[PDB]
Tab-separated table of N, CA and C in Angstrom:
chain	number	residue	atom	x	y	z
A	1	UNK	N	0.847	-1.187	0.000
A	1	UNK	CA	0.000	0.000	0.000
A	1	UNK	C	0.883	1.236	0.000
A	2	UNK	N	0.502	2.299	-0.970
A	2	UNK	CA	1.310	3.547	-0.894
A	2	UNK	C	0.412	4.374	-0.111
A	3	UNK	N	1.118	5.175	0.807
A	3	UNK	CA	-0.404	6.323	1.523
A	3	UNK	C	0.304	7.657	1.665
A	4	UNK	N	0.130	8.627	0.713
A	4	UNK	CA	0.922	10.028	1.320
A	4	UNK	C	-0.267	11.235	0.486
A	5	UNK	N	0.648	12.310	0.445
A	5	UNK	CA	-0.121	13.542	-0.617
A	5	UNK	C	0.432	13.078	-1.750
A	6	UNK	N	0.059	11.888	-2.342
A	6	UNK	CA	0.109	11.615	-3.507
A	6	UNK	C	-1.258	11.536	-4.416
A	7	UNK	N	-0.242	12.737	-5.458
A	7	UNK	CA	-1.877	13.569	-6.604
A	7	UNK	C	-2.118	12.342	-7.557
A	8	UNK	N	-3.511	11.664	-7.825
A	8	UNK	CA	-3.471	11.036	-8.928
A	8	UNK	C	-3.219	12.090	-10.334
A	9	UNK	N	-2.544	10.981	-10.843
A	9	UNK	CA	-1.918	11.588	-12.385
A	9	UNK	C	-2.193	10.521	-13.473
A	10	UNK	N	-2.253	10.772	-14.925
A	10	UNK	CA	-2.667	9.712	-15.765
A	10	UNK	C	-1.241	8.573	-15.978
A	11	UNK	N	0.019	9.220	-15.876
A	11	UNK	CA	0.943	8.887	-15.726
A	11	UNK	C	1.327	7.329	-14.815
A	12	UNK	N	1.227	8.179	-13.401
A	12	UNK	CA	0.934	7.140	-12.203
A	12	UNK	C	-0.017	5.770	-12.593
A	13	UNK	N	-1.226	6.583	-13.381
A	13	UNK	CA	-2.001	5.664	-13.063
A	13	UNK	C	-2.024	4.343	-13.981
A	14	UNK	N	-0.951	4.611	-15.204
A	14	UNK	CA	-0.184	3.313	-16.006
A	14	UNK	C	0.369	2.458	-14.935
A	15	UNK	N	0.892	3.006	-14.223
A	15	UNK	CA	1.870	1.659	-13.554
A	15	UNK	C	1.346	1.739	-12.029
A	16	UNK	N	0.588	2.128	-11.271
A	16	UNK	CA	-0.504	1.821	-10.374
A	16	UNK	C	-2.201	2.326	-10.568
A	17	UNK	N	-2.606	1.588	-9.135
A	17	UNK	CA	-3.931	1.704	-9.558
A	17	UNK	C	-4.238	2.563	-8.128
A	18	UNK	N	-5.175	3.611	-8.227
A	18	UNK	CA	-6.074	4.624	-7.331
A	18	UNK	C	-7.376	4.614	-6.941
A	19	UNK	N	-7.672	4.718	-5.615
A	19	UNK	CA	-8.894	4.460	-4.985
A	19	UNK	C	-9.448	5.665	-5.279
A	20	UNK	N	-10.716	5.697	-5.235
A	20	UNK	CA	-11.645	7.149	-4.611
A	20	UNK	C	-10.697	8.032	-4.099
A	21	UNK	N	-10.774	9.489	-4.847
A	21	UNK	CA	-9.902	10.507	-4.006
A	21	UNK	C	-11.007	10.488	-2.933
A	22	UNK	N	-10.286	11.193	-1.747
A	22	UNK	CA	-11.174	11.435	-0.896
A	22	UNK	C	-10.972	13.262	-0.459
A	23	UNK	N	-9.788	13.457	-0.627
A	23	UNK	CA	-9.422	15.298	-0.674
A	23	UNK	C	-9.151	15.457	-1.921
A	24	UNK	N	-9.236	16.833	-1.956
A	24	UNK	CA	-9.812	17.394	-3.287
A	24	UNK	C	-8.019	18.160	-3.416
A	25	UNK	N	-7.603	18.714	-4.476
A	25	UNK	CA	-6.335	19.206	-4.791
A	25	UNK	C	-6.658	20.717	-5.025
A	26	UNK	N	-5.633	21.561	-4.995
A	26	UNK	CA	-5.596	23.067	-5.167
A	26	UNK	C	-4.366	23.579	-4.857
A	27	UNK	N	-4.235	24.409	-5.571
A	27	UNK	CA	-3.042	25.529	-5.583
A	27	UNK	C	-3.484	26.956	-5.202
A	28	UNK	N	-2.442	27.043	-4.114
A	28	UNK	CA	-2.933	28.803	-3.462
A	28	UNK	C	-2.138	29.025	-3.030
A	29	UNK	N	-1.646	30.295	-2.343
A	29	UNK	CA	-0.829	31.425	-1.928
A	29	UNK	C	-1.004	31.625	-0.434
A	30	UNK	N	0.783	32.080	-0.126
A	30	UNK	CA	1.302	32.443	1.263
A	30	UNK	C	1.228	33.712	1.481
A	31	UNK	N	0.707	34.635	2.059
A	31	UNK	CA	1.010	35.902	2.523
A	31	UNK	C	1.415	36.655	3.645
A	32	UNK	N	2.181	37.289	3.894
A	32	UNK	CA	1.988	37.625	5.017
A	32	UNK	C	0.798	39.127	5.380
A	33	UNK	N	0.784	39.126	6.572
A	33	UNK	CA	-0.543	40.419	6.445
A	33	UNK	C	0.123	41.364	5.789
A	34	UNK	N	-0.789	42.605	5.171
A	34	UNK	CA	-0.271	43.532	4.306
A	34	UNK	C	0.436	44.919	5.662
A	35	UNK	N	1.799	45.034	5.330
A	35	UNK	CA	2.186	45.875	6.096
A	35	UNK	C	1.885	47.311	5.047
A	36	UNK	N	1.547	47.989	5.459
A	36	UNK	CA	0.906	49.115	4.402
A	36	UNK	C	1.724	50.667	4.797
A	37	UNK	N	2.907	50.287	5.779
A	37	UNK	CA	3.862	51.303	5.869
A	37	UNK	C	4.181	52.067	4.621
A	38	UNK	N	4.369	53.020	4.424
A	38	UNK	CA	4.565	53.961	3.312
A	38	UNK	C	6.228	53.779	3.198
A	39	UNK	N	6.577	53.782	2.224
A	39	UNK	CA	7.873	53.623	1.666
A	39	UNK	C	8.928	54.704	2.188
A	40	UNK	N	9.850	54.042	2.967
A	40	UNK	CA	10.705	55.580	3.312
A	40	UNK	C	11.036	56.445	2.929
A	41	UNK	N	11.327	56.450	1.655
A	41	UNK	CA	11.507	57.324	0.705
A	41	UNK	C	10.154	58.193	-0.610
A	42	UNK	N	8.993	57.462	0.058
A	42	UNK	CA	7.531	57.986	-0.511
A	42	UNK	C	7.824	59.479	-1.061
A	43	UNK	N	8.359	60.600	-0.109
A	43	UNK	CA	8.463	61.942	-0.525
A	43	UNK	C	9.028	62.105	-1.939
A	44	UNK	N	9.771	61.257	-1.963
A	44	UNK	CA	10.389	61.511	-3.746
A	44	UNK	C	10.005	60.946	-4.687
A	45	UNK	N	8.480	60.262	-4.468
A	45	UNK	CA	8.304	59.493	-5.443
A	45	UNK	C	7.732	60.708	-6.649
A	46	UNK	N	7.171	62.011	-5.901
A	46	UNK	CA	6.450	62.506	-7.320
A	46	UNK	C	7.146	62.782	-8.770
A	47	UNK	N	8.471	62.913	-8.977
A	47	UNK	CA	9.018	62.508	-10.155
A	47	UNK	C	10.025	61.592	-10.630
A	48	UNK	N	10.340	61.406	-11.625
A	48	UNK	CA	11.151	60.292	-11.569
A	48	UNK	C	12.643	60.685	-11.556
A	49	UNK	N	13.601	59.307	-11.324
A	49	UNK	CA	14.984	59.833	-10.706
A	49	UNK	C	15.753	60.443	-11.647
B	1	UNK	N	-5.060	42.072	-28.437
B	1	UNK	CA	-5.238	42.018	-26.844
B	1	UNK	C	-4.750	43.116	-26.292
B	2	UNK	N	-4.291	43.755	-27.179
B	2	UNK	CA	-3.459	45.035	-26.249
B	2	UNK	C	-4.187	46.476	-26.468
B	3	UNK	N	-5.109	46.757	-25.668
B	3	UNK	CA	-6.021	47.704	-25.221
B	3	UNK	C	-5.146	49.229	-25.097
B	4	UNK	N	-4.020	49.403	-24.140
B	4	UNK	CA	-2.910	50.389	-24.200
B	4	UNK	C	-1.869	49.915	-23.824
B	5	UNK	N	-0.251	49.915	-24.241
B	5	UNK	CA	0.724	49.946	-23.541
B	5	UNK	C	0.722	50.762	-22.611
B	6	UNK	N	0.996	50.357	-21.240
B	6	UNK	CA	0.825	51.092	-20.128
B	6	UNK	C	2.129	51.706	-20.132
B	7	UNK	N	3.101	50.479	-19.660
B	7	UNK	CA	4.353	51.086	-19.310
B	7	UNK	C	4.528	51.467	-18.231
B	8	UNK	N	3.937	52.856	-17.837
B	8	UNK	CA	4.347	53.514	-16.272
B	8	UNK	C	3.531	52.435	-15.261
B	9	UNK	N	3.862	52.525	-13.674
B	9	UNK	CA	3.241	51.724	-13.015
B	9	UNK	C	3.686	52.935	-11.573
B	10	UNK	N	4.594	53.608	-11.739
B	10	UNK	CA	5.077	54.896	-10.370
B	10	UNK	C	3.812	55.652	-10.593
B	11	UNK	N	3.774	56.286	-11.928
B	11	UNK	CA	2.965	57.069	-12.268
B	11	UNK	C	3.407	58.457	-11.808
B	12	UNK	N	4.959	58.455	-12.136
B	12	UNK	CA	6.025	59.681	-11.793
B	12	UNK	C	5.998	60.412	-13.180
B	13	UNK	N	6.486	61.786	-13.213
B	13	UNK	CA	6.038	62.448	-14.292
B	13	UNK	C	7.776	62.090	-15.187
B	14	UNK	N	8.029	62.188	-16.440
B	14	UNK	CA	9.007	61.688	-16.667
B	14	UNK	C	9.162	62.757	-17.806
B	15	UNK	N	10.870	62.463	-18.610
B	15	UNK	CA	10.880	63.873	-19.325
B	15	UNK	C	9.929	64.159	-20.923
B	16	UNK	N	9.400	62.549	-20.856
B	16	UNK	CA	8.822	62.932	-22.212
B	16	UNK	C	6.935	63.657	-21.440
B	17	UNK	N	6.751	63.084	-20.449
B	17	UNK	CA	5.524	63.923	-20.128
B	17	UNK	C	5.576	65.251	-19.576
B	18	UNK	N	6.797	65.335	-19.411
B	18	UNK	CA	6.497	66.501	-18.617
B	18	UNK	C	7.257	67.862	-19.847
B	19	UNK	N	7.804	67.038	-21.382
B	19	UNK	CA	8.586	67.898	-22.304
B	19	UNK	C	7.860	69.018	-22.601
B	20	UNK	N	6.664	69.605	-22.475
B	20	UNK	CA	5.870	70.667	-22.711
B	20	UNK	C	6.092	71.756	-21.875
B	21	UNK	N	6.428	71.679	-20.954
B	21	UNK	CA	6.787	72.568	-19.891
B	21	UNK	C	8.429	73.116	-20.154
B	22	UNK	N	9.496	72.447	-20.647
B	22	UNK	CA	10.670	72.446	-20.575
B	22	UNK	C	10.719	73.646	-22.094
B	23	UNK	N	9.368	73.512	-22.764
B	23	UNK	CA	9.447	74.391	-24.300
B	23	UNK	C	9.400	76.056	-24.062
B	24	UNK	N	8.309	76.431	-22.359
B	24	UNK	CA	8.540	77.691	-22.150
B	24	UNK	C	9.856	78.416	-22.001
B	25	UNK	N	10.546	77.675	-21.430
B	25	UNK	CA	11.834	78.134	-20.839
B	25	UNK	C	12.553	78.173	-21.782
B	26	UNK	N	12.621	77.070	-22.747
B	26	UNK	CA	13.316	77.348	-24.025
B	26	UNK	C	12.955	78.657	-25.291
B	27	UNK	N	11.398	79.047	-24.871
B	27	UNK	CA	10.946	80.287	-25.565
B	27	UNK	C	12.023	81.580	-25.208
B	28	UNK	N	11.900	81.237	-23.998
B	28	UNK	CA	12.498	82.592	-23.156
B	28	UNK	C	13.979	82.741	-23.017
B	29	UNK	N	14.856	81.451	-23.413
B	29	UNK	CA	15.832	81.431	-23.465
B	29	UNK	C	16.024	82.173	-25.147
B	30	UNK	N	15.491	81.521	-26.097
B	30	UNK	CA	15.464	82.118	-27.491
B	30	UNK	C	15.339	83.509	-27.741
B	31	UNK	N	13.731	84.053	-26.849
B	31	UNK	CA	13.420	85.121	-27.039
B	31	UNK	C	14.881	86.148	-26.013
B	32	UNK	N	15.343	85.778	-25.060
B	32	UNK	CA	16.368	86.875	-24.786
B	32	UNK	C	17.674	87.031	-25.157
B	33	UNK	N	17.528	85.870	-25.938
B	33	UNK	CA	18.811	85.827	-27.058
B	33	UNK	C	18.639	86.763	-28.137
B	34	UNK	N	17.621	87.162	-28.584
B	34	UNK	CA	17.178	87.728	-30.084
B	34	UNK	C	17.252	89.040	-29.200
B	35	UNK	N	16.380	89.536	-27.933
B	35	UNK	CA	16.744	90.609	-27.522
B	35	UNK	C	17.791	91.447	-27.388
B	36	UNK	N	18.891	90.840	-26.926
B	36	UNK	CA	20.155	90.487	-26.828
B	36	UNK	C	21.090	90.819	-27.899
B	37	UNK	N	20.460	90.259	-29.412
B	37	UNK	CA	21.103	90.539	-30.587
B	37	UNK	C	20.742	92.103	-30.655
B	38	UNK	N	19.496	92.088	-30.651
B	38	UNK	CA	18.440	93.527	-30.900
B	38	UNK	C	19.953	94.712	-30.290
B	39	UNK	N	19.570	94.539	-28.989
B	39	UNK	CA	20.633	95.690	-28.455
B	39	UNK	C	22.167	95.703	-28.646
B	40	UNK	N	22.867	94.396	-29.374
B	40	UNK	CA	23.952	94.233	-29.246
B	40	UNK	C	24.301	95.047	-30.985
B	41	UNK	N	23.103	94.619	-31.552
B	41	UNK	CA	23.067	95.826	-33.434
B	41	UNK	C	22.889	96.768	-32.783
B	42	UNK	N	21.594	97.544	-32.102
B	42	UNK	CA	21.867	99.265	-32.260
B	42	UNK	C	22.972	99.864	-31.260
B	43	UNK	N	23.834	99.223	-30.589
B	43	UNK	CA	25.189	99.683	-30.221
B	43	UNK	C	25.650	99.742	-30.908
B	44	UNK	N	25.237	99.741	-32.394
B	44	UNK	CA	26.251	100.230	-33.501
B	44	UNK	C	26.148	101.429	-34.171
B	45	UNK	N	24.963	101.905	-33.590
B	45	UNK	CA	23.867	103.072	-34.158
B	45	UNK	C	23.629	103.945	-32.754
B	46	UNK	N	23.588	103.754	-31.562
B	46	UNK	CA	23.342	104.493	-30.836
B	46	UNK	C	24.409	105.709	-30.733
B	47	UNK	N	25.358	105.577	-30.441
B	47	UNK	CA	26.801	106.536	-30.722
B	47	UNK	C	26.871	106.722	-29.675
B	48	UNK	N	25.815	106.197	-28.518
B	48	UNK	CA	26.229	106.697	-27.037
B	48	UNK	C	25.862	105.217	-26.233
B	49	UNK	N	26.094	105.076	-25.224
B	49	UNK	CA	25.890	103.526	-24.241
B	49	UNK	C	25.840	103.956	-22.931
C-alpha cells in the first residue's frame, strides 16, 4: 500500500492503480498580512529619478 | 489584446511627459537671445551707451 499527498496523475495511473480521491487538490498562496507602511523614501516618489 | 501599452506603473512624471513645460523656458531662453542681438546691433547706431 502507498499512503501520502500523492496527486493522482494519468501517468501514475499506467503503472498503479487509485482508490476514490477522498481530498480534493488546489493551488494557493502564502502571505503575510499587508504591512501598508509607506515607503521611506515615498516623498520623492512625485518625479522620476 | 493590447487595449494600451501602459508602461508607467510609479505614475512619476518623466521627461517625455512633462517635455511641454521644458518648451517655455526654451521660448524665453530664445526670445532673450534675439533681444540680446536687438541691443547688441543698435550699439552700432546708438553713438552713445
Amino acid at each position: 500500500i502507498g499512503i501520502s499527498a500523492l496527486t493522482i496523475t494519468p501517468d501514475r495511473e499506467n503503472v498503479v492503480d487509485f482508490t476514490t480521491r477522498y481530498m480534493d487538490y488546489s493551488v494557493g498562496v502564502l502571505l503575510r498580512r499587508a504591512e501598508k507602511t509607506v515607503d521611506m523614501f515615498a516623498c520623492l516618489a512625485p518625479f522620476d529619478l | 489584446y493590447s487595449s494600451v501599452d501602459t508602461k508607467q506603473k510609479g505614475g512619476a512624471l518623466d521627461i517625455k511627459s512633462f517635455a511641454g513645460v521644458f518648451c517655455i523656458l526654451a521660448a524665453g531662453i530664445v526670445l532673450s537671445c534675439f533681444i540680446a542681438m536687438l541691443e547688441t546691433w543698435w550699439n552700432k547706431r546708438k553713438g552713445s551707451r
